[PDB]
């Protein structure tokens, strides 16, 4: 994989836009605002372990990674040609949209004055997690969990056991090299299990940040004036191997809590991506 | 829209100033300090949903975007001339004025010692939201709400339903591309519904930040020594299409809470804008 | 030790990768998720002093330093040659993996609603400590403890007494030059005792940060796009004396607390290291 | 006002030093530590509104701006000379002195253990406000209050009514261009009313920051190694019109609270200024 000069001429540079909607737990359908669709953009009620050895989170309570594989313009006539062209992601403008909606404090969440059930509807608060990646192949994931004893559903989610065909081991609570996967499905890989693998991702740039806590104030900036350069130390950005551009993200704002038993629901927001790509000559 | 050289000569550069007052809910009139006017700069008492399916916020409890369209000096004799001139916004000095007024802790808000009704009058705290934009056309808005079931008044505010003529759908809690609008009216577009659209705003620069929480300390800096460059990666700033310069903003400092049922009122502060514009030759 | 030119030619530059798993107290074995292995990645329950003069922490309740000594490619034929080559660490990409696992709030920890035993499983919070070092010899440690009267176990951990053969002195609560050691064993040197020695470490670069508190929200960033330059003011990086590269770290995220007597367990996460090394001519 | 070259030669550059003591409410005299003087550097007890329409803060409970007008060396023989010289403020080293005094937690304030009246004397906490300005004329102020109904004393303080001769209007809770003043007296303009006017102050540089909250920890840095450049985008600093250099500031650290009814007293600290000035030729 020799990377040569930038290709010049008509259409050697292109822009790709996309928004990835969050995957907090409640699927996009049913759309009915009375049959579950009113939780889209949120997780369903987080259910807790019933004992130290009985922790089975429902799939719709586990935020998962969002991902999209975008198709770029075709490039090579001759595939047996000594020198071909590849799309190179140069930079990305990305933005999490909707933080202002968090200013709705007039709903029916747990109120701030619980003695009289007054005040305001408590806004979303808590743990936040923002990660996005742009690469030329799926984001490589390293699994690591809080508890290797957690009983994740066998269906509907991709967990470490889905990959290894075996039960998690104690090493899965730290770095177990065996527990790897690729983010190749949207809404299926729980973010409390799968993390960007720093030992791989040679062709993907990822950026994440985590803020913990139970009532931590969410903080978010948004501007259309910032660009993230995806070029590495050698001036080379992610190269689209099959002309497939991979976008990955997760944007958890925290939880809203209901007036019944403090049931928490994760809140996620959509992320916008505008990727600038250029053609690169490759040998 | 070919952008050419900067125009030189007498009056090729100009400065425009404006302050946009906040739109927190209580309109500017009545002015009477006994008939409602005493709430100008604040929202009226935030009223809460009465059930999970009955959330009808009053219009005067919903901060909305502030916007102004400023007229710039006329430019072109010949409109059928191959090369015309356009005003280009180069930079802006902007400032949110009045945070010092938040130091009044001698009023009648909920006191800090509630056992004896003593201490100080609790100052403004909570969720903060600061956004401003400068562009050559209205700020493009993407709607996204906390709850697609919220029953916003049909009159007095522009909501997603005003635009689509239909009820919100579950997709409106995430990114629904159909829910778009333009900030073309001051005090009408609620900020908990309408967000800068990152997929558009090619000719507008916007910058916002959100801090959540219920008692989060407001933080604010102000100096007349800072400038925000509005030029893009190509050195081109927003171009005033009809010589109309659009200013948009929202500056929520948090809430003050009364001594009756913890009623919260949003507090907003005015924003000052000093935009430097230059004439640009356009083909 | 005269440092000359960089060696050029085939294989003069090399990359080395490694992940160091945390050493919070529970060893890697037994692996059994019922015999202790379920605490791997965590410390065992923190036990408190029984009086002002009886403080005997269990070894498995004390996070210790992680360290690894990596073997690099051999270099010198002639050891009696006027000019030899040495491996020089130029830079390191390092990352603490797994913060997303902290988003599991569905387990059996102390719940956020203790009155009804509801809400969510409190996530990991508290004191955080992140330190990593890359050097050409073991990290030099300076001992300093909260209490020189603490009765650390004599076996299983390397403490100041292990080194001095005598009991700690009051000076061990501040800087006592006599209390020095080298981080030459993984999982043995408690981080509450051993700190990077600023008076030594001429051939090691270390970087640490501490955040205290009992419920402080853990914060962590991770990206594969950042590099830490290890070169000193003279453009020289750590030199691998016996071609042994030393990696050291500790990454405490805070504690989880159980539903029984608020027993706290430290949580640590693995750290990834990708070190770029180049050959240097030395006289 | 044409600004020409910098004047060169003997004494063309000069330094001016000054410290402005805080104006929190209690005047410098009486000096008696039993007759009120013990509150100098603090405000007197903050008294609260007795109803929604009765808010009469005492003057000594309202921090006001500190300001000093310094006389610089005389400059011009000939005032009818085509080209004169003016003093130009180039930069300032400024510092808020005394934060370490906030480490006195052995006094008689509300204690941290209120059940037994033990622990420590609660240190100053809360809302902080730091602003300083250096200009060639008085700082231009824009009035904006929390409540236009507040009954400020007519004597002893300069309020919006002092300036307009009329009662405040609802517009005074937002930006009302009529409510302007100049900071031309020390200890008279309340900071909860008067803010730097961004629409004016062409010849003054101001910098401020606000942190709200009721128990927010005060934060402060101090070093003698930092300089603030006062030069504008054209390399011109404030010009001293009548060779009078204006220094303005306010530095509120928060409040201390007593053991009786949680009475709060604002704490302010003095600010030091070292201004470097140079002579400028003006046409």
């Amino acid at each position: 994989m020799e990377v040569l000069d930038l290709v010049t001429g008509p259409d050697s540079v292109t822009e790709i836009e996309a928004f990835l909607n969050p995957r907090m737990g409640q699927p996009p359908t049913p759309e009915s605002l009375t049959e579950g669709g009113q939780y889209y953009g949120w997780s369903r009620g987080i259910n807790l372990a019933t004992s130290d050895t009985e922790d089975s989170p429902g799939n719709n309570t586990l935020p998962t990674w969002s991902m999209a594989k975008l198709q770029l313009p075709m490039l090579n006539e001759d595939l047996t040609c000594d020198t071909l062209q590849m799309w190179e992601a140069v930079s990305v403008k990305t933005e999490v949209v909707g933080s202002g909606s968090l200013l709705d404090v007039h709903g029916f969440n747990k109120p701030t004055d619980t003695v009289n059930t007054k005040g305001i509807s408590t806004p979303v608060e808590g743990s936040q997690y923002h990660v996005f990646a742009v690469g030329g192949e799926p984001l490589d994931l390293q699994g690591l969990v809080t508890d290797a004893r957690t009983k994740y559903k066998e269906e509907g989610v991709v967990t470490i056991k889905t990959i290894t065909k075996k039960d998690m081991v104690n090493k899965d609570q730290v770095l177990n090299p065996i527990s790897k996967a690729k983010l190749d499905k949207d809404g299926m890989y729980p973010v409390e299990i799968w993390h960007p693998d720093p030992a791989k991702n040679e062709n993907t740039r990822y950026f994440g940040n985590y803020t913990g806590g139970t009532t931590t104030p969410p903080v978010l900036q948004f501007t259309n004036t910032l660009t993230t350069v995806l070029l590495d130390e050698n001036g080379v950005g992610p190269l689209c191997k099959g002309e497939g551009l991979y976008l990955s993200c997760v944007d958890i704002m925290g939880w809203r809590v209901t007036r019944n038993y403090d049931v928490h629901h994760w809140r996620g927001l959509p992320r916008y991506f505008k990727i600038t790509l250029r053609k690169r000559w490759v040998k | 829209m070919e952008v050419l050289d900067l125009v030189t000569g007498p009056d090729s550069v100009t400065e425009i100033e404006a302050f946009l007052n906040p739109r927190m809910g209580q309109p500017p009139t009545p002015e009477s300090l006994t008939e409602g006017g005493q709430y100008y700069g604040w929202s009226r008492g935030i009223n809460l949903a009465t059930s999970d399916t009955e959330d009808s916020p009053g219009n005067n409890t919903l901060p909305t975007w502030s916007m102004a369209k400023l007229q710039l000096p006329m430019l072109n004799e010949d409109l059928t001339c191959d090369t015309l001139q356009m005003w280009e916004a180069v930079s802006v000095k902007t400032e949110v004025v009045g945070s010092g007024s938040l130091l009044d802790v001698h009023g009648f808000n909920k006191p800090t010692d509630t056992v004896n009704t003593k201490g100080i009058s609790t100052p403004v705290e909570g969720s903060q939201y600061h956004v401003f934009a400068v562009g050559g056309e209205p700020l493009d808005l993407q709607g996204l709400v906390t709850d697609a079931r919220t029953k916003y008044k049909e009159e007095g505010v522009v909501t997603i339903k005003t635009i689509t003529k239909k009820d919100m759908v579950n997709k409106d809690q995430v990114l629904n591309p159909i829910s778009k609008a333009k900030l073309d009216k001051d005090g009408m577009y609620p900020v908990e519904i309408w967000h800068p659209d990152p997929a558009k705003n090619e000719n507008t620069r916007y910058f916002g930040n959100y801090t959540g929480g219920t008692t989060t300390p407001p933080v604010l800096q102000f100096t007349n020594t800072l400038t925000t460059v509005l030029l893009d990666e190509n050195g081109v700033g927003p171009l005033c299409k009809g010589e109309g310069l659009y200013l948009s903003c929202v500056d929520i400092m948090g809430w003050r809470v009364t001594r009756n049922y913890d009623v919260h009122h949003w507090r907003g502060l005015p924003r000052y804008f000093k935009i430097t514009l230059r004439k640009r030759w356009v083909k | 030790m005269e440092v000359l030119d960089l060696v050029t030619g085939p294989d003069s530059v090399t990359e080395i990768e490694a992940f160091l798993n945390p050493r919070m107290g529970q060893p890697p074995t037994p692996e059994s998720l019922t015999e202790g292995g379920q605490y791997y990645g965590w410390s065992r329950g923190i036990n408190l002093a029984t009086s002002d003069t009886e403080d005997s922490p269990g070894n498995n309740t004390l996070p210790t330093w992680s360290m690894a000594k990596l073997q690099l490619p051999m270099l010198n034929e002639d050891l009696t040659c006027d000019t030899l080559q040495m491996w020089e660490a130029v830079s390191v990409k390092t990352e603490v993996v797994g913060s997303g696992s902290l988003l599991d709030v569905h387990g059996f920890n102390k719940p956020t609603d203790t009155v009804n035993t509801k809400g969510i499983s409190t996530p990991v919070e508290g004191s955080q400590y992140h330190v990593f070092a890359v050097g050409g010899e073991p990290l030099d440690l300076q001992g300093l403890v909260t209490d020189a009267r603490t009765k650390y176990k004599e076996e299983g951990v390397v403490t100041i007494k292990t080194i001095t053969k005598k009991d700690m002195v009051n000076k061990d609560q501040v800087l006592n030059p006599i209390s020095k050691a080298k981080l030459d064993k993984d999982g043995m040197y408690p981080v509450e005792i051993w700190h990077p020695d600023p008076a030594k470490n001429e051939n090691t670069r270390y970087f640490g940060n501490y955040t205290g508190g009992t419920t402080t929200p853990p914060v962590l960033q991770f990206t594969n796009t950042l590099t830490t330059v290890l070169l000193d003011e003279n453009g020289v990086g750590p030199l691998c004396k016996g071609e042994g590269l030393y990696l050291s770290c500790v990454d405490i995220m805070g504690w989880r607390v159980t539903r029984n007597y608020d027993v706290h367990h430290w949580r640590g996460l693995p750290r990834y290291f990708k070190i770029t090394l180049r050959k240097r001519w030395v006289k | 006002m044409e600004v020409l070259d910098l004047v060169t030669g003997p004494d063309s550059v000069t330094e001016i030093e000054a410290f402005l003591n805080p104006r929190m409410g209690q005047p410098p005299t009486p000096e008696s530590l039993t007759e009120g003087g013990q509150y100098y550097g603090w405000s007197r007890g903050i008294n609260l509104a007795t109803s929604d329409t009765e808010d009469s803060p005492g003057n000594n409970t309202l921090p006001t701006w500190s300001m000093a007008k310094l006389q610089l060396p005389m400059l011009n023989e000939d005032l009818t000379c085509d080209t004169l010289q003016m003093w130009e403020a180039v930069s300032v080293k400024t510092e808020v002195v005394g934060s370490g005094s906030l480490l006195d937690v052995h006094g008689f304030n509300k204690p941290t253990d209120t059940v037994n009246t033990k622990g420590i004397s609660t240190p100053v906490e809360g809302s902080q406000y730091h602003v300083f300005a250096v200009g060639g004329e008085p700082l231009d102020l824009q009035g904006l209050v929390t409540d236009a109904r507040t009954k400020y004393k007519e004597e002893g303080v300069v309020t919006i009514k002092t300036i307009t001769k009329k009662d405040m209007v609802n517009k005074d809770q937002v930006l009302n261009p009529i409510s302007k003043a100049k900071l031309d007296k020390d200890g008279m303009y309340p900071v909860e009313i008067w803010h730097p006017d961004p629409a004016k102050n062409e010849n003054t540089r101001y910098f401020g920051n606000y942190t709200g909250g009721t128990t927010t920890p005060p934060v402060l840095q101090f070093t003698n190694t930092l300089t603030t450049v006062l030069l504008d985008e054209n390399g011109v600093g404030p010009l001293c019109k009548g060779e009078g250099l204006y220094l303005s500031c306010v530095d509120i650290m928060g409040w201390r609270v007593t053991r009786n009814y949680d009475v709060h007293h604002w704490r302010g600290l003095p600010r030091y200024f070292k201004i470097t000035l140079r002579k400028r030729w003006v046409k």
Binding site: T94, E95, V96, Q128, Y129, H130, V131, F132, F207, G208, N209, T211, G213, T216, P217, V219, L220, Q221, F222, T223, T225, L226, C249, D251 | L6, V90, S91, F207, T225, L226, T227, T228, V229, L231, G235 | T211, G213, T216, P217, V219, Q221, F222, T223 | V229, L231, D232, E233, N234, G235
Partner: peptide, 29 residues
């Protein structure tokens, strides 16, 4: 305080100090 953000959270914008304006400007005319 203790709740940071510096990656995936749409990042911080800056401003230019007035006196630095020409330079910064001269690069985009």
């Amino acid at each position: 305080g203790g709740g940071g953000g510096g990656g995936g959270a749409a990042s911080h914008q800056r401003v230019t100090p007035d006196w630095m304006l020409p330079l910064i400007l001269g690069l985009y005319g």
